[PDB]
Enzyme design. Sequence first.
Site, PDB file in Angstrom:
ATOM      1  CB  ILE A   1     -37.755 102.365  50.124  1.00 60.43           C
ATOM      2  CG1 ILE A   1     -38.027 101.717  51.486  1.00 60.43           C
ATOM      3  CG2 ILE A   1     -38.033 103.870  50.114  1.00 60.43           C
ATOM      4  CD1 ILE A   1     -36.968 102.054  52.626  1.00 60.43           C
ATOM      5  CB  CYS A   2     -39.645 104.137  45.017  1.00 59.73           C
ATOM      6  SG  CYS A   2     -40.475 102.666  44.504  1.00 59.73           S
TER       7      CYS A   2
END
Lengths: 155, 155, 155, 156
Positions: free
Chosen positions: B90-91
Site C-alpha cells: 500500500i502506498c
Amino acid sequence: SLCLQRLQEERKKWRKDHPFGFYAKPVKKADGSMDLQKWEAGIPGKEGTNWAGGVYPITVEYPNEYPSKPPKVKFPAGFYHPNVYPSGTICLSILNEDQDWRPAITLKQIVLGVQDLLDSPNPNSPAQEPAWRSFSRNKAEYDKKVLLQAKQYSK
Amino acid sequence: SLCLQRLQEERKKWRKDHPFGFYAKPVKKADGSMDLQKWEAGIPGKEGTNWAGGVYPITVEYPNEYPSKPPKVKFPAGFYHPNVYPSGTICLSILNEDQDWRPAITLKQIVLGVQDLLDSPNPNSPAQEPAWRSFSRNKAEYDKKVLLQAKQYSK
Amino acid sequence: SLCLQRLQEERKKWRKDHPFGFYAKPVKKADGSMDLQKWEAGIPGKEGTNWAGGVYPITVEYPNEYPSKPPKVKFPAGFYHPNVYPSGTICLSILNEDQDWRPAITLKQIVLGVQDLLDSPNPNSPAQEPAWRSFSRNKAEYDKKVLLQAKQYSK
Amino acid sequence: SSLCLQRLQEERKKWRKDHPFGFYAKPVKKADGSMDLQKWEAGIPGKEGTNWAGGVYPITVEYPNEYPSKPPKVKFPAGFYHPNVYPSGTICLSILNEDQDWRPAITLKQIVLGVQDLLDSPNPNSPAQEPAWRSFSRNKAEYDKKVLLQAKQYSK
C-alpha cells in the site's frame, strides 16, 4: 476521419525531420499496408547518462478518438523505470487525457518527453514498485540495473 | 531490542483501545509463540461507501530498525485499489520514511490511514494501472469491482 | 515444535556440509536471535552454462507444518526464468507437496535442485510468460537475458 | 447552495460527455485528490483563421455558493491581453453578468463558446483594459502583433 488524417500528417512531419537517433514508423499489416494507428519507435538514451548507448523500443497505439485522446505509449512489459508500469505503459502527464494531453502535441514532443523521463524519474507518479524502491532507497543498485538495461538495448 | 519492546507495547495497547471493527495480532510461529515482527490485521470498509461490509486483510511487517523505520503494510497480492501495487504493497505517505513516517505513529493511526485511503485514492500514487484506468475513465466499472471485492472480503 | 527441532538440525548440518559456492543462513530478528523459519541463501550458476558467474539470492520460508509441508523458495520478484512466477516463487517438483516433496529432503537437496532447474526449464510449469515465450520462440533473446542477469548477480 | 453542487455534477457529466474540439474543462483537484466542483480550469482555443489561432487560452471558472442563481466568475491569467479583460484577468461578457444576460439554464459549453467569440470580436461597451483598447482603437497593427505573439505564448 480526423484521426487518420492527423496520423498521415504526423508521418509526413516525422519523415521530414525528427530528432537524431530516434526512429518511428507505422507497423505493417498482413497485406503489407500500414497500420496508421500502431507505430513502433525507438528512443536513444542521452549521452552522459547511465541510459547512454541503449535505444529503447516503444509502441504507440492511437485510439480512434485521437487526437482528442492521447496515444498509449508502451515500453516492453518488464522495462525497468520508476514511472513505467509492469505492462510497459508509460506514466507521463502529457500522455494523460485528464492532465497535460492536448490535441496539438506532436510525436516529436512525445518522444522527447519520454527521452527526458528516462534519466529524470517523477516522484509524484511512481508506477513500478521495485524500480521506485531502488531509485529511492538504493541508488547504487538502481544505477547498476539501468546500466545493464542500457546494455540489453545496445547494438 | 527497542523494536521488540515497542511491539510488545503496541500489542498490549491495541488490545485495549483499538478502532471498532478492526483486528490485529502477531502471527503464530511453529511453537505457538508470537512473531512480534509480523502481524495480521483487518480493515473494515466504511459504511456509506462501496467498501462497506468488507473486512480487508493486511500483513504488517516490522523491520529490525522499527520504529526508526516504518513497517511495510500489504493487502493480498492482486488486491484492487489505485494505490495498491500488484504485490499488495500500500502506498501511504505515513509509511514512507522520507515523508510522513514518525516513530510515534501507532498501529491505530496506520490502520485508520489505510481505511481512509480505501474510498479516497491519492493521485500521487498511480500504483495499479487498471484500477486507475477505471477510476478515471469508467467510474461505474470501478465501483462495481469495489462492490464485488467487498463481497469477496465479507463475512 | 518438530518444525523448529528439524530447522535447528538443518542449520547445524548446513554449517558442517554444503556445496561450494552456496550459502544459507536464518535471518536475524531485531534482538539478534535467528528466525529459524526464514533463511536467506545463494545459488551459484553452474560453470559452462549461461548462468555461470551469478550467485542468485533466494529466501526460504518454512511453514509451521514443515517438514510435513515444503518450504516456499523465492528468487527476487522479477527474476527471469520460465519456471519462476512474477512474485519470484520457484516452481519445482520437490517443492510441491502433491508431487515430489518428502519430509526427509534436506536444504542441500533443495538448493542443488534449484541449481539444476536454472539451465533446464520445465514445459509443464510455464510460470513466467515472457521468459517461456523467449525460450520457445526466440532462444537468442532468451540467452541474452540470462547472460545479463548472470552479470547482474555477478561478483 | 446544495443545488449548486448538484448542478455542477450535471455540468461535469454534460461536458465530459460532449464538448467542442480543442476546448477542455475540469474541476481542479484538492490536496486529497478529490474535485473542487466550485473551481474549474478550462482552455479556450483561438479560432482558426483569426490572429488568435494556435493558442489555447487558460481560464478559471469560479462558481459562487449561490450558483446557478448567480453566474460563475471567469478569468484569464492576470495581464492577459484583450480589450474586454480586466487587469485581474476577469472577462467582461454579457452572459456572465447577472445585471445583463446571465440565466440559470446557461451551460458551460455556452459560456466557453461566448468567451471564444469575444476573442476576435471585442465589445466597445466594455473597455476593461486601457492598453489593449487603445491599440485596438488607434493602432490596429500594434494590436494584431500583440495578439499573434500572445497566441504563441499560449501555443496549443
